[PDB]
Symmetry: C6
Subunit: 157 residues, 6 copies
């Protein structure tokens, strides 16, 4: 998987798809909307989980989403439910909105709570091993990250 370099709105998640650890690319695109209510298109992910993430970004991090068309896409055609994808969704969207990309060597694991906190998920060890195997060198996960704001200060400030 050889992907777009330095385009904002891209974030790698160390996911569990079914029973298998996979590193996947979460993509997001944000744009000033013409319509009265902003478009919210989600493909390959749980739209509801995404809404929660979008709400946290807007309310807890002050991202100006309410007039922004937001598209979120899991590259590669899979459909994945994993709560561990939240972090990557949160950061892809943030990256897409402020227009600066994430490092290419970073992989992301975590549940996102309505308070903006990052929460433990199943299979952290497997997820991390697979990220190592796939060649990543920096990791944000619930072991080393507690609040979403910290990850933003660290990579998207």
């Amino acid at each position: 998987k050889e992907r777009p370099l330095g385009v904002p709105g891209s974030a790698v998640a160390l996911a569990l798809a079914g029973e298998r650890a996979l590193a996947l690319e979460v993509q997001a695109l944000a744009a000033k909307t013409p319509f009265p209510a902003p478009r919210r298109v989600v493909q390959g992910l749980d739209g509801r989980r995404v809404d929660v993430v979008l709400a946290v970004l807007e309310r807890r991090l002050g991202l100006p989403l309410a007039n922004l068309d937001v598209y979120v896409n899991l590259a590669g055609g899979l459909k994945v439910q994993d709560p561990g994808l939240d972090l990557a969704v949160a950061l892809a969207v943030y990256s897409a909105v402020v227009g600066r990309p994430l490092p290419a060597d970073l992989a992301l694991v975590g549940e996102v709570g309505l308070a903006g906190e990052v929460r433990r998920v199943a299979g952290l060890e497997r997820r991390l091993r697979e990220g190592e195997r796939a060649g990543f060198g920096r990791f944000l996960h619930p072991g080393n990250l507690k609040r979403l704001q910290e990850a933003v200060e660290a990579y998207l400030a």
Copy 2:
């Protein structure tokens, strides 16, 4: 202790678990406000919110409201109503619940708290998980009492 978070002693399938119910409320930019529900039955959350607005006088009509069951699971369990009601109230009013409190109960349209399956298993799991204080249909009859006792 950020406001808008409440611990329910749930039955998920056959299994008793302490789960975190979360809510966020803020002024809506829109004609009709957003209701988003994750991990919980949307119609039950809808009933609870109507009780909160109409029986308790919580001004939800111009608020965006988001309710989230933390942990990944999707649980339909009437027993979660109490946590949902309290999480929302807390969130709206900016005052948090104690960290050592766990909640169980169905919530009716009159604002009353109703018996649910598996009370003893729920309570045991709360004890085991380290909670010190409990609100359940055995010691609570109405939402109002819970709000008075904890949300000042």
Copy 3:
């Protein structure tokens, strides 16, 4: 099941849930709506059956529903399809709108037709026995009630 005393909008139905006779509490709440179209939330019941009942109340009994938010709820988490629940739905809602409760010793059985009539249902005997067993002393059912208007004159005038 020890329930709210003298709150309007509460009505006991002698239902068939699957194959079993159960006495259940139908609850309704009515409120002056802020929105242009009034909310209609139904939980644990057939929304369509409810609509028919709401239409009969408005058109045949003159209940001023069109600007009223109406919530109807089957207490106890079950989801029940029984047509025999119509009567209780009709009376809960009526009670909730006019703001006077039903007697606590009354149990209700019947289908509601679009003309406002009350119609026979399956398992009347079982339903009634269970109501007796559960301690009720007064019964409206298709054996003793033909029109919805009669039940209203009798308990909610």
Copy 4:
């Protein structure tokens, strides 16, 4: 004999039954009026209403319309179209149908009445149930004839 009620000789699964189709119509408070259907296929009711408005000139565009299959069953049976059409017409125009009349037929977009499965079983069940007069694809070709013969 209140208007807006018609008896269909239906096939529900394999079984012939005489069922009551009911309709209610009244002036709508709204920009677009309510269509509520219970116990019947909503798209078939939709087609029938379009025939009633466009072929027969019934002024349904500003009417609330409710159609109800009495008895609890959900039946999809093209054979019910005739009763539905007549129940609605009756309701709109405030004139009832005789009590001894039973109806069978599919209704096309031209307003015609079309053959259906199981005519003889349907008719036998009508006889047995005590009905005296019948409208079916064997003796009726168009909705208009039915309306002229019974809804004056």
Copy 5:
């Protein structure tokens, strides 16, 4: 099946329902709409396939559909997915809009593409035999028809 004579909006399709060749009547009714957006009711057919056909009629053949209520109905209660029904849907609707009927001896087979072309379908031979058996004498199908416009010039000009 003895059907309405010379009413516009009627078109016979030689369909495959499941595995069986059947001649079926596609009916359409078009009317000047009161609402802002025009009604689109489809019964017994694939609504999406119909939309494509309606789009072709409007965009490629200049039918003034945008303010027209359109109802399309497969007579006889079946629900059929066959792409071979497109032609008949296209011509029923056209017939209903311009208010002139199709000949009663004509049967129709074909897929309709977004360019207005008519495309091959499965089971042409079976379809045609059944049309012959049912007593039709003229046939439009992909063997003898390439563009939708040709069929219109031939029967609905």
Copy 6:
């Protein structure tokens, strides 16, 4: 060679086929324009259109858009994205693609073209079906290149 038509080398289930993807675009009469999709996943078409508008500057916001998978099949296959993107572009801009060209590729939100399952089977089927020229993830990286090479 009418504009708005593109040939994809698809995997439908296990099977490689050359299929025609079609699009039509025209000025919308409405506040918000129509999106109709047939035979393809609507969310994937939605993503592709957003890439076309936001990355490539195609003015889709006031256009009605219809996308059709010719042939009857319903195929979900990320490999179809390229044909969909090109069919739409072509349609909007009134310039057609050569008749001998076949296309394969997933399209990301950055406008890039991504690897898909079964490339060799897809290409073999294209050869066999008589196509002379191919665009696939082995020789194309971005949508822009495809647009420059063929849609002038």
